[PDB]
Amino acid sequence: RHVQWCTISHLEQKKCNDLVGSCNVPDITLACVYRSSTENCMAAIKDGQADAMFLDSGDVYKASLDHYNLKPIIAEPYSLHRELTKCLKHRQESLGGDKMVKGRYIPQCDEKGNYHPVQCHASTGYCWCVNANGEKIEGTNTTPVQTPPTCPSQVLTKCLKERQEALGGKRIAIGRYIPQCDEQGNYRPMQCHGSTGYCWCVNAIGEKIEGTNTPPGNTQPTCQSHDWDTCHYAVAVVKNSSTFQFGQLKGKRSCHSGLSKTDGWNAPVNVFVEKKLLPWDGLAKGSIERAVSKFFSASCIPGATETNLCKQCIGEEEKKCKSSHDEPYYGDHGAFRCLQEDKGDVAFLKNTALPDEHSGVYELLCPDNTRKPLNKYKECNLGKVPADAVVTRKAGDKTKDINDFLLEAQKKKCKLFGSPHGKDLMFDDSTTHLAPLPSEIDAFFFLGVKWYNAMKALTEDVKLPSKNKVRWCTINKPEMMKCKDWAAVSGGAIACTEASCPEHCVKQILKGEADAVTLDVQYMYMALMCGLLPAVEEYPNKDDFHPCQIPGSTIKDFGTKRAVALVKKSNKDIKWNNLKGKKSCHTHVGDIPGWVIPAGLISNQNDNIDIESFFGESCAPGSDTNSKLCKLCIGDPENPSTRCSLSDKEAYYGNEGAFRCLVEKGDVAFVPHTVVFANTDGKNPAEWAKDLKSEDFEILCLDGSRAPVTNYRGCNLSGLPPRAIVTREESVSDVVRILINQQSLYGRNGFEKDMFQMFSSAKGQNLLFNDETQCLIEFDRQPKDIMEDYFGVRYYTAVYSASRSAVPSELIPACTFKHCSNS
Numbered sequence: 010r011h012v013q014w015c016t017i018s019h020l021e022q023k024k025c026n027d028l029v030g031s032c033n034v035p036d037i038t039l040a041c042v043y044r045s046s047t048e049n050c051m052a053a054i055k056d057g058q059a060d061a062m063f064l065d066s067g068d069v070y071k072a073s074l075d076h077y078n079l080k081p082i083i084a085e086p087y088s089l090h091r092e093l094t095k096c097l098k099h100r101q102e103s104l105g106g107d108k109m110v111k112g113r114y115i116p117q118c119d120e121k122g123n124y125h126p127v128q129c130h131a132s133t134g135y136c137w138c139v140n141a142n143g144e145k146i147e148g149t150n151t152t153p154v155q156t157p158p159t160c161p162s163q164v165l166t167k168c169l170k171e172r173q174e175a176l177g178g179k180r181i182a183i184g185r186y187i188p189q190c191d192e193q194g195n196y197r198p199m200q201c202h203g204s205t206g207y208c209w210c211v212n213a214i215g216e217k218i219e220g221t222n223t224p225p226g227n228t229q230p231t232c233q234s235h236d237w238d239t240c241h242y243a244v245a246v247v248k249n250s251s252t253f254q255f256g257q258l259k260g261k262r263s264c265h266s267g268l269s270k271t272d273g274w275n276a277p278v279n280v281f282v283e284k285k286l287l288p289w290d291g292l293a294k295g296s297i298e299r300a301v302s303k304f305f306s307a308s309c310i311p312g313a314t315e316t317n318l319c320k321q322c323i324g325e326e327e328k329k330c331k332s333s334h335d336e337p338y339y340g341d342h343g344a345f346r347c348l349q350e351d352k353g354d355v356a357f358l359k360n361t362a363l364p365d366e367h368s369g370v371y372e373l374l375c376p377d378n379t380r381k382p383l384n385k386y387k388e389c390n391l392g393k394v395p396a397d398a399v400v401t402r403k404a405g406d407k408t409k410d411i412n413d414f415l416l417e418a419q420k421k422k423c424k425l426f427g428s429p430h431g432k433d434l435m436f437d438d439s440t441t442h443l444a445p446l447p448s449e450i451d452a453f454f455f456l457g458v459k460w461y462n463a464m465k466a467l468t469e470d471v472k473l474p475s476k477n478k479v480r481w482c483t484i485n486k487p488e489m490m491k492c493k494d495w496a497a498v499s500g501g502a503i504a505c506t507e508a509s510c511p512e513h514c515v516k517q518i519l520k521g522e523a524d525a526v527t528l529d530v531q532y533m534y535m536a537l538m539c540g541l542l543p544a545v546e547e548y549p550n551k552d553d554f555h556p557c558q559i560p561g562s563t564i565k566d567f568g569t570k571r572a573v574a575l576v577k578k579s580n581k582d583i584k585w586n587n588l589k590g591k592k593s594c595h596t597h598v599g600d601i602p603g604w605v606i607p608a609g610l611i612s613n614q615n616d617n618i619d620i621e622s623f624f625g626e627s628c629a630p631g632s633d634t635n636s637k638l639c640k641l642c643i644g645d646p647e648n649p650s651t652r653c654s655l656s657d658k659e660a661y662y663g664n665e666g667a668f669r670c671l672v673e674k675g676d677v678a679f680v681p682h683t684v685v686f687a688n689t690d691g692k693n694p695a696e697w698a699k700d701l702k703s704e705d706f707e708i709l710c711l712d713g714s715r716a717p718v719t720n721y722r723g724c725n726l727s728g729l730p731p732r733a734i735v736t737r738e739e740s741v742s743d744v745v746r747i748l749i750n751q752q753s754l755y756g757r758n759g760f761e762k763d764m765f766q767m768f769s770s771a772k773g774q775n776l777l778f779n780d781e782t783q784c785l786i787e788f789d790r791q792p793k794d795i796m797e798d799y800f801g802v803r804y805y806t807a808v809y810s811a812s813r814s815a816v817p818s819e820l821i822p823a824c825t826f827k828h829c830s831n832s
């Protein structure tokens with residue numbers, strides 16, 4: 010296995026070459042491929058000449074476009090603010106679940122708020138070991154009949170682990186820095202070197218605050234406590250011997266880290282434009298680079314083409330003004346060097362390249378026309394900027410080899426993050442750890458919508474779609490054709506987009522490519538986790554059109570299905586709490602009322618033991634034919650084998666089919682509340698149903714009691730939430746207004762329902778909306794968690810343990826990735 014690293018300069022290639030010799034990662038060999046600039050390396054990776062390089066966030070954006078088709082895969086984790094510990098959040102979520110779902114696991118947290126390594130389930134007496142995230146170490150479960158397991162102690166905090174390593178197992182690390190930790194095991198704000206006498210400030214995860222390093226005998230700056238804001242900040246640095254302010258920058262000389270860098274270009278230009286220092290607003294006033302060319306007298310901006318914007322660079326011959334360390338003024342530390350050597354009056358870079366020392370001739374130029382000390386960048390800056398990242402081809406053919414190499418190299422403490430040859434070679438010298446990003450991350454979710462759009466805005470005039478138009482996302486060709494017919498009558502209120510599946514529709518809406526889509530319940534957890542909101546919902550109650558006639562009216566019964574546990578009156582012995590080992594009938598694997606809701610409750614109350622293992626002999630179509638979930642299944646009265654099959658071939662498949670299995674060879678059936686009334690009181694002519702009586706059956710309540718099948722509203726496993734039309738938070742009001750108006754024209758009582766029907770089509774069944782929808786009803790948003798508000802507390806608890814930590818789609822870690830954005 011090989012990893013070919015692309016280097017952009019002679020210096021970087023030297024450092025990369027040193028790592029080939031000094032860093033021994035077994036099984037994976039590093040190699041170094043030279044190119045002359047950042048852009049030539051991007052092309053080399055696209056072409057397969059190389060596999061990986063580290064890119065500034067601005068280049069991550071440029072590399073994500075069709076010209077290069079690269080994606081970020083690895084980056085240094087950052088923090089925005091202090092957060093609850095995982096264990097205490099989990100405790101709060103589980104304690105907030107539905108109290109009628111008895112016997113659920115509530116985590117046990119220690120005096121620091123972390124998980125005890127031994128976790129136990131009170132109602133079952135089971136215990137097990139957990140990692141730091143409180144996830145079960147599988148295979149450590151111990152029954153109540155035995156002593157609790159012995160579990161490894163929790164991994165130490167960064168500070169305590171860095172302390173232990175610095176002590177190298179020897180009791181005092183003489184002459185070397187030993188971190189000083191607080192009682193929670195985080196870094197004390199002030200750190201001192203035990204031999205040199207120097208002191209400086211660090212944030213809560215131990216990153217040094219620039220401008221605070223203090224030699225012995227001098228007074229230190231004050232160190233802020235509980236600093237969990239570890240985003241990098243764009244700053245403008247100046248010498249204290251000059252006197253101009255930010256608003257007087259016109260006509261000065263400037264040093265920029267680079268034309269494509271977020272801290273050297275996007276951040277300052279963004280502020281120049283907002284303050285109207287730059288006579289430029291759109292691509293009709295020329296290019297942004299040309300306007301900046303007219304603003305400054307002479308600059309060094311590596312990668313630029315305008316002559317005066319390369320005039321201050323000092324690279325020799327063709328190396329001059331190259332996006333490469335062969336230009337000595339390239340990058341953050343090159344721009345600072347350019348100021349230091351007086352080729353510029355101001356340098357544009359980020360806080361991590363500022364001098365560590367408090368005292369000296371440098372300070373910050375704030376956009377509010379004041380100047381402030383180096384250590385006040387959090388209040389004197391041009392914005393937070395995104396993280397930077399290792400990138401590779403979108404195809405990801407080398408992602409595993411790249412990640413494996415860098416994880417092992419860091420375990421072995423190879424010299425990745427410094428060099429005698431220069432600063433910020435290969436990686437930023439400030440980097441301390443590189444971690445894999447979410448597998449489905451791309452530049453949009455890595456940078457975040459705010460910075461992504463801000464960078465796009467410098468390259469093209471982004472025409473913002475109208476708030477009077479809903480772009481509807483369709484998932485198949487018939488849906489798109491029904492939507493084109495809707496657009497034709499809508500007078501411009503409706504437009505259409507196409508995706509392959511509901512999750513790609515969610516992605517389009519997030520990225521501003523569509524505005525709305527109707528989602529099945531099984532997709533709503535992912536949609537709500539990504540930050541979309543229900544705007545309207547499909548109301549399916551055929552017995553009450555009054556909420557559809559008069560909008561805003563009160564709804565007595567939304568009419569969704571209720572999952573129930575159905576048993577016969579004769580079997581008086583069976584209750585909820587003794588269903589273990591009994592015979593059960595399920596509509597089919599994957600059905601929400603017949604499978605997902607019951608499986609969720611069984612899992613919550615029995616330590617995630619398989620619904621397969623919980624019952625005795627069952628029929629649940631879709632299971633493996635050899636398992637005990639198919640033993641009850643009667644394949645086909647016209648024998649072919651079609652047993653336990655997901656078709657009408659299986660006699661026990663579906664709503665009515667699970668009702669058969671109950672009456673014939675069954676003990677309990679998991680069904681919508683409607684199935685019993687639909688097949689008793691002489692409504693199914695079939696022989697088995699005959700004139701079966703609705704009074705002959707009951708439903709099991711979660712409290713061990715029973716009730717007649719007519720009380721499904723108060724004795725159910727869970728009610729289902731309705732299907733929802735989702736959109737971005739800021740578009741809810743427009744989408745509600747447009748859809749409610751469309752519904753007054755083309756709904757079931759629409760004034761123009763002869764021109765178009767929203768809830769049917771000749772092109773197919775359930776296109777865009779379910780054909781049984783009575784109307785769409787505005788979601789009445791309540792002051793609670795949207796998870797509880799949309800799912801209902803019972804469903805949220807039964808299916809998701811009332812937790813925001815389930816991952817039913819690998820999109821969730823990418824769409825919830827946090828960003829370094831401004832207001």
Ligand SMILES: NC1=N[C@H]2[C@H](COC(=O)NS(=O)(=O)O)N=C(N)N3CCC(O)(O)[C@]23N1
Pocket residue numbers: 546564565566567568569730731788789790791797798799800801802
């Ligand atoms: N905001 C809000 N309104 C409700 C409507 C459905 O309303 C009924 O289900 N009514 S019911 O039939 O009377 O139970 N939409 C939802 N997804 N929900 C789920 C929980 C909830 O019913 O409270 C509700 N949350």
